[PDB]
Amino acid sequence: HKDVHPAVLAVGQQMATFALKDSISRLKATLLAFRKVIESYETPKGNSLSRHFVPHVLNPQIEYLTECRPMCFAMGNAIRLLKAKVNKFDINTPEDEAKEGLLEWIDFLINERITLAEYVIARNAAQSINDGDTIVTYGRHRLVEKTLLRARKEGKSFNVTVLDDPYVGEGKELAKVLRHAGIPVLYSPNLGGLRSKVPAASNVFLGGEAIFANGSLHAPSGTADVAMAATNAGAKVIVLCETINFDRERCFRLLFDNTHERYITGVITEIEF
Numbered sequence: 001h002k003d004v005h006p007a008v009l010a011v012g013q014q015m016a017t018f019a020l021k022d023s024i025s026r027l028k029a030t031l032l033a034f035r036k037v038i039e040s041y042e043t044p045k046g047n048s049l050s051r052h053f054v055p056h057v058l059n060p061q062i063e064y065l066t067e068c069r070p071m072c073f074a075m076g077n078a079i080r081l082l083k084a085k086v087n088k089f090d091i092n093t094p095e096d097e098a099k100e101g102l103l104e105w106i107d108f109l110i111n112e113r114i115t116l117a118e119y120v121i122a123r124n125a126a127q128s129i130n131d132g133d134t135i136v137t138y139g140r141h142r143l144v145e146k147t148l149l150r151a152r153k154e155g156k157s158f159n160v161t162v163l164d165d166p167y168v169g170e171g172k173e174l175a176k177v178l179r180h181a182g183i184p185v186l187y188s189p190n191l192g193g194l195r196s197k198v199p200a201a202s203n204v205f206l207g208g209e210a211i212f213a214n215g216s217l218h219a220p221s222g223t224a225d226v227a228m229a230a231t232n233a234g235a236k237v238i239v240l241c242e243t244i245n246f247d248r249e250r251c252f253r254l255l256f257d258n259t260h261e262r263y264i265t266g267v268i269t270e271i272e273f
Contacts, residue, residue, distance in 0.1 A: 117270035122146035141207025215261030
């Protein structure tokens with residue numbers, strides 16, 4: 001409880017419960033809870049939001065969320081942007097007008113960095129897919145799934161190989177969905193016989209949790225083995241990721257590995273121009 005807004009409390013519990021797993025879902029839930037925090041916010045008498053809000057109201061929510069789980073880059077980036085937005089306000093700024101500005105700024109951020117970003121990445125990545133292609137992917141990543149569904153809806157006929165982590169198994173669900181969409185899928189529960197699974201002609205599409213300043217991809221463990229195997233075969237390795245997941249400024253950890261940029265052919269983001 002404490003200073004924590006109930007909306008934030010519920011979202012953090014979802015993060016710690018592991019009900020919310022990916023960085024993008026975590027970010028959206030956070031932005032919406034923060035949206036409610038701002039709605040609820042009332043400036044103390046003789047004070048301004050520009051001076052009071054960040055240290056007394058916003059920061060306790062962030063501290064609570066950090067306690068539930070270490071924050072992803074997406075959350076870190078959004079928070080830095082929001083705090084800069086608050087700083088554009090002055091003591092003379094009226095509260096209703098400040099609150100409305102923050103609310104439209106959050107809505108704008110969700111749309112541009114999450115909602116529209118997913119559509120644009122899937123559409124632009126699907127452009128890379130052509131008739132007769134063989135696509136390789138690992139586990140189930142939402143951007144990869146959206147891309148494959150988009151190419152199929154565009155009328156393209158292609159093959160998909162889905163590789164998995166034997167301990168997680170989410171890829172089986174992806175294979176299910178793709179098959180339902182009419183896509184022929186080859187499913188492997190593990191990374192056994194990896195060189196066989198990734199030929200030179202195939203294209204590998206991967207998604208992750210973050211991209212570091214050095215260009216490496218933070219992604220579920222076993223992603224790196226797939227990218228390394230493909231890079232050695234001469235196969236293209238395409239990583240799909242929202243810009244908000246980039247580190248622009250520079251337990252849970254164990255189930256991630258690092259894919260060095262050397263094993264990544266290119267990254268597709270929502271940025272078009």
